[PDB]
Scaffold this active site. Structure first.
Site, PDB file in Angstrom:
ATOM      1  N   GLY C 361      41.067  37.597  36.051  1.00 15.93           N
ATOM      2  CA  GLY C 361      39.961  37.779  36.964  1.00 15.93           C
ATOM      3  C   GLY C 361      39.332  39.153  36.762  1.00 15.93           C
ATOM      4  N   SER C 362      38.235  39.370  37.512  1.00 17.79           N
ATOM      5  CA  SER C 362      37.344  40.521  37.367  1.00 17.79           C
ATOM      6  C   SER C 362      38.026  41.882  37.529  1.00 17.79           C
ATOM      7  CB  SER C 362      36.245  40.345  38.371  1.00 17.79           C
ATOM      8  OG  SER C 362      36.854  39.859  39.554  1.00 17.79           O
ATOM      9  N   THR C 363      39.222  41.934  38.123  1.00 14.98           N
ATOM     10  CA  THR C 363      40.029  43.153  38.074  1.00 14.98           C
ATOM     11  C   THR C 363      40.086  43.712  36.680  1.00 14.98           C
ATOM     12  OG1 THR C 363      41.425  42.244  39.800  1.00 14.98           O
ATOM     13  CG2 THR C 363      42.242  44.158  38.607  1.00 14.98           C
ATOM     14  N   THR C 560      38.059  38.278  41.107  1.00 14.53           N
ATOM     15  CA  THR C 560      37.803  36.863  41.312  1.00 14.53           C
ATOM     16  C   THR C 560      37.857  36.192  39.956  1.00 14.53           C
ATOM     17  OG1 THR C 560      36.332  37.483  43.097  1.00 14.53           O
ATOM     18  CG2 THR C 560      36.348  35.276  42.472  1.00 14.53           C
TER      19      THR C 560
END
Lengths: 629, 595, 609
Positions: C361-363, C560
């Site tokens: 995810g975007s992390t 996300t």
């Protein structure tokens, strides 16, 4: 300036109808046709956008610096900068300008052709051309092509220039022979749904072998993808397929007319090899004379990829398996260079790419020996060949005394009666067995015992110094090597079967070559390499210099000693250290212990009666010994 | 049954939803995904049709021989024949078969991959390839190319040097094309004679979206003939695109070919033009406004069709500067016009026609001498200011003398003496009003506007090549051929393989044997109007001509062998310039090569 | 040398070979008759002596050496050999057998004596064989607290309303329990671990489901387990998953045993084998039992995963997975109803989500940015201009658009981290390109296997050595695409932000030494991004701003992956004492990892400094 902002909203609505491609909604916002209002009727405006904006796949239109200023009570001038996406790239810093018509608090656009592209005028038009790119080659260490794109001599027949019932049936006979192909296949080819009488019907690809041609039979020159080693390198190199709609969904940058790698290196390097399509977007006058170039991207042909593979070593290694199930891998152990990656059986990748009969295709798909598998990357139990790892650890940790002689009777053994009916078996009933004797005869019982003496904790401390669990920095699909199906054995039976290369070990032939390289680098492990320009990578002190100097002399004697399992190789006259292997499958490991110039790992899957890897190794070992010193 | 015809409706609606490209509606008629129901979800089906039927541009699906029968309680089978249209052709007599699921009165379709194309299975796919054709060449009579497609040396760099590197699209390390420090090899259309044959051959342009509307059998990547012969034969030259529609397995391996049309490259077109004659003919017009036509009069073969000024067709086709393009478009002598097809007054040259008509019907006696004084003449003072003019004040004047000095007044008087009805009976044997079977756009030749002259003045001006006559240079070559064929007229020919067509007895064998000797003397005799061509030393018959700004004319042919004929015109001549002064380099070429 | 000697030698060897095959009847036929100078027993009594004694000890694999056969008189030959044998308790070595043979008209027999069972036996002497089961070791947390222990469990039972409501069951279950096939009227019936209760030895997991997937559970030993490993006892328990299975050999110990010769009354006369029982070793983890319980409860029963470490050493403080199962019922008694619940639940409670590979995810953007900054592609201050929520390189991308949630027009790096701007990173990735991107991604731990007792697939970048698309290049730059990293592998990669670019590998065994991988990202990329990661919290528009209420020093990034997977990464940038990676899988409406993070962040912040 509510009329001003009503004019701003009118521009923005026009632009947004375009972004959604709602070219009809946008044409509904134009003034009537007039010398002072719009220059075209509504439908004439609808068509311009469908033709030009449809043709260029215009979307993603973003305007900025919008200005709307009053000229007179019913006329407002506007100006904005825009960027847009076309199918050839992004257009940036367009200067649009026009006027608006105010007529009873209703505001429309005085449409002009310079609201398609800024500089357009009158009857100007738009052209959009592409130049596809040519696929790069795949080359061996010496530049010989393994995958190349070029002209191909293709064979075919015309049904009309063939006869009726008399000659149509004997010319079939005549062209069937000249070119080694079924006389029935020519009947099914000429009778497919698509075959009009006066068409060219393709039959074979040929290579510098065009005879005097029978009648009806004509050859034409076709651009194609070609694999010179054919099935000898089919699993490594892969093959390329026709591009489909489904491919363009997943990646819409592809054109319907290219080819795409479906397996092997053809798929692993497909972006580098396929290049980038060229293209041009131009405004032209009414005759197609270019007046302004908007986007121009020169085609870039695909890059060549150079391997470490030796095409001769590759052909020889694959032929030596005589079509049986198996795999051979060969390296230059001190650098990692992978000289051959052969897998047997195989398939004709030239047919998969340029045309394969429904018959030949069903052959491959149902064959139970599974030619589409890359066996050099398939995990296997390494077999008793593995004993040289166990022994190297043994010596490193102190467990194994090279001179300690064990006494073993018969062919079966177990630690005690608590193992029930599970027994370690060996093949030769030698009574007095030290390390040397155990490697020479392939003595599983000796190794079973020295493992149990060493214990799980000491074995795994040695095993752990290798490359179990890692993924190898290589463009080949492969699962990492495991020791067992879990994180500890929880059996002495399994601990011991593992000491002689059985159990739940899975190491594919490329990984085995990497592990065994320790014997050619004083205990340092050298990682396999397949791309020629890459740098060599090592792992030092994986095993000790003294375990190696103990084991290699014993591996020479697996060859030289008359009771050695690979003594049929002493006839060749070349310096070899080797260990043979069996799992429950026949194995051979070998390298030159004088110059470390080469190493090989060969396997025969489901060996036939008295067949073996060792019997098939001579032609490749002679080649490698001479060319890698 | 209600349930059987409930099933027939569902088939007809599914199929009709497909024609309408309403792929969402069609997948909405499918059964749930199950081993004995549909093989895919609603969206896997919406996508399969979008991919395949969208990709091939399927439309116009027509079913026939529909059959629906109950197989068991909850399942009814269907089968039909179909044909459909793809972007590569029409598929005929496809045999579809399937089953329907009736669950509480409602009829759904048990979707399976064989409801895209009969032969599909599982995760099968569809590939659709094209091969674009190579444009044929236009060739001269000797196979030398006038329009060819091939490789070109394209100079570029990674005044006009500065405006080029600084166009919107020119990023730093791009190759920027200059004209035909780095060179690259690119495919293009090329015109070897450049501007010297531009109006005849034409030029080709980028294909546009607007072109694909009017003719969507074209490809975005081709070129298209925009004028001249490139356009007249564009279909023959452009060939036909190859194409293939295949069902493939999941990896793109071909399992069945549904359509294969092999590429057909374009046909060559072989002309009668002689490329050397054409370059010489054009070069000799010195960039002035004018036209040259040369033929082999006994067969019609058109050896040269020159028009001046001209334009660079290589720039219109591969790249032309904004300045150079506006030059051509604003130039008032009009380089884009094909003057060899434009109708003009033929000028005093035409007298040899009148003179032939006279001798056929009896009006003109070769030896009868007229008496003429001064450079002006008129029938009587009822003519106001209109006077037939001449340049040379010769007193006594028979026919020969008249051709030698170009004596407009003599021919006027003999024309009135012959009268409209006898004049027209000769003219009407020629090719006025006809269209010539040639791939060049041209209006037929007229005598006057209305079917009578309606003036005596106009009748006389017509006798010496003026008035309301309109004959374009090819039409002149056609009429004037009678003097190299014993009175027979030979129609011009431009396509090398076509057969010669003639029209016999247009003028009499005797008019010709009288006039041609007099036409030799337009050269040899020192007061002859074409005396400057005796310097060359070749057998010539010729007649010079003027029409009124003034337009200069020359007609000439070799009377020993009839090997060649030429008609050259200089439009609005400069002082002391003339067609005859410009004709030597081409007469030398023709005389040597056509015997 | 004599045929009579070598006939005697073969008569011995066949006698031994018949015993090895358990062919005791064949061997007794080689005995002489019963007499004061021949055999001591009849052929039947001898067969039975071997069946009892050799049967009891599972004698087999008997190997002789130093065979000697000598003439005593014409009809009597003496013999002697050394022997080794396998018993069910081990191998007997250097046994000294001796006896005599009977030659009687070419036929050679054995003058049997009890000392041809075991060397010392005499008369009616006998054999005893005893075993001692071992007690299973513990599994312990970093502070010695038990996660798996063996001890005494207060099992409750009955020999109906008043005892279903005091301890709290379904009064139905009391009827189905008493009415099972085996329940005699006078038996004790087991009902619950905590109407008469008695004290039972059992395997017990104090954290229950909070650690069920890591620790695992133990099962009855079955006939099949002993086939695959017949060093097991019928009476043990055996680990079926998790560390219980991963460490089962160390945990189970070694069974004790003793093989003895006795007189006819059981008085030991000679000890042949004695192996003392060895109870199992304790296993000590890095787990913090409080961190584990808190981490798991904070996931509120939804699908998800929490992973917490001390980044400067690798210590794994918590490995929680939700939903989960009750390992105490799996081990000590579970109704068919509860068991069908677990196996049929579609959220899959038996999965170890902390070892499952997922798209990070975007992390992931903070990894890309670090690479971007190390190689120069990204200028921290360069501002990009972005309009709307969707973006694509050009129209040749079809329908694939990078989307974002906040329509900021001007966007440099700090801003892109604060708002989670997928588009900014998509662009900055394409600007550096596959070859530069992968040179960064490769310095991490893709493809490696972690030296841990948890089965897990290694982390990949994509399925092949290349993306073969620009689109995929871009989705990978903000943590989508063909990225697969499980939560432990995420923690290992993100540790670069707590060690100045050096990566520190996870540790689950407390005494194992720390291993790192230096200079993975640059010291200046780290000093640029952590300040931006404080503001994902502190700044009012940061995606994690709801954690500034807690009052603790945090750096964090949210994430996300698109169903919808919610992510939180967070750590203390002042002391690098703890790091956490939480994931909420298939988020409900407006629920997220960040909203569920507060009570674990409070515990970790105060206890790990």
């Amino acid at each position: 300036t509510q009329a001003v902002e009503a004019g701003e909203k009118t521009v923005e609505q026009f632009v947004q109808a375009l972004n959604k491609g709602d070219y009809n909604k946008a044409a509904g916002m134009a003034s009537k046709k007039a010398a002072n209002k719009s220059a075209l009727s509504e439908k004439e405006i609808l068509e311009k956008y469908q033709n030009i904006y449809g043709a260029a796949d215009v979307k993603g239109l973003e305007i900025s610096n919008l200005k709307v200023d009053k000229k007179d009570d019913s006329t407002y001038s506007f100006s904005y900068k825009a960027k847009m996406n076309t199918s050839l790239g992004e257009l940036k810093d367009l200067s649009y300008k026009g006027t608006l018509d105010r007529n009873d608090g209703k505001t429309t656009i005085n449409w002009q052709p310079n609201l398609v592209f800024p500089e357009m005028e009158g009857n100007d038009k738009v052209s959009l051309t592409t130049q596809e790119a040519t696929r790069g080659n795949i080359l061996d260490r010496n530049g010989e092509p393994l995958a190349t794109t070029g002209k191909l001599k293709q064979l075919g027949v015309v049904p009309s220039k063939l006869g009726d019932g008399d000659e149509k049936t004997a010319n079939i006979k005549a062209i069937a022979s000249a070119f080694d192909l079924t006389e029935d296949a020519i009947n099914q080819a000429i009778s497919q749904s698509w075959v009009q009488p006066d068409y060219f019907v393709p039959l074979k690809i040929i290579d510098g072998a065009t005879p005097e041609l029978p009648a009806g039979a004509t050859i034409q020159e076709v651009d194609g993808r070609y694999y010179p080693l054919g099935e000898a390198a089919a699993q490594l190199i892969g093959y390329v397929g026709d591009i489909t709609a489904e491919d363009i969904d997943k990646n819409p940058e592809l054109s319907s007319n290219g080819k795409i790698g479906r397996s092997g290196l053809e798929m692993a390097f497909d972006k580098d090899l396929r290049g980038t399509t060229g293209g041009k977007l131009s405004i032209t006058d009414t005759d197609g004379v270019e007046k302004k170039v908007l986007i121009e991207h020169e085609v870039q042909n695909g890059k060549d990829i150079k391997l470490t593979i030796d095409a001769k070593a590759q052909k020889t290694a694959f032929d030596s398996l005589g079509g049986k199930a198996g795999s051979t891998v060969a390296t230059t152990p001190k650098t990692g260079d992978l000289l051959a990656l052969a897998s047997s059986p195989s398939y004709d990748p030239n047919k998969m790419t340029n045309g394969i009969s429904q018959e030949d295709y069903k052959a491959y798909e149902e064959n139970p020996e599974q030619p589409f598998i890359s066996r050099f990357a398939t995990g296997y139990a390494p077999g008793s060949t593995f004993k040289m790892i166990t022994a190297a650890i043994g010596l490193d940790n102190g467990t194994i005394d090279p001179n300690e002689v064990l006494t073993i009777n018969g062919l079966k053994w177990q630690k005690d009666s608590s193992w029930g009916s599970y027994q370690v078996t060996r093949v030769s009933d030698v009574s007095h067995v030290d390390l040397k004797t155990a490697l020479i005869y392939s003595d599983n019982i000796y190794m079973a015992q020295e493992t149990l003496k060493m214990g799980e904790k000491n074995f795994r401390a040695g095993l752990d110094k290798f490359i179990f669990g890692e993924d190898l920095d290589l463009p080949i699909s492969m699962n990492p090597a495991q020791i067992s199906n879990e994180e500890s054995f929880n059996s002495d039976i399994l601990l011991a079967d593992t000491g002689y290369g059985q159990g739940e070990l899975l190491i594919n032939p490329i990984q085995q070559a990497a592990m065994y390289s320790v014997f050619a680098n004083n205990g340092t492990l050298v990682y396999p390499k397949l791309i020629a320009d890459k740098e060599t990578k090592d792992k030092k002190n994986v095993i000790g210099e003294t375990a190696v100097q103990t084991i290699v002399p014993d591996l020479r004697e697996v060859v030289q000693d008359v009771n050695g399992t690979a003594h049929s190789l002493s006839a060749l006259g070349i310096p070899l250290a080797a260990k043979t292997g069996t799992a429950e499958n026949s194995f051979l490991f070998a390298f030159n212990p004088d110059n470390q110039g080469y190493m090989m790992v060969s396997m025969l899957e489901n060996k036939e009666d008295d067949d073996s890897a060792t019997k098939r190794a001579p032609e490749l070992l002679q080649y490698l010994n001479q060319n890698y010193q």
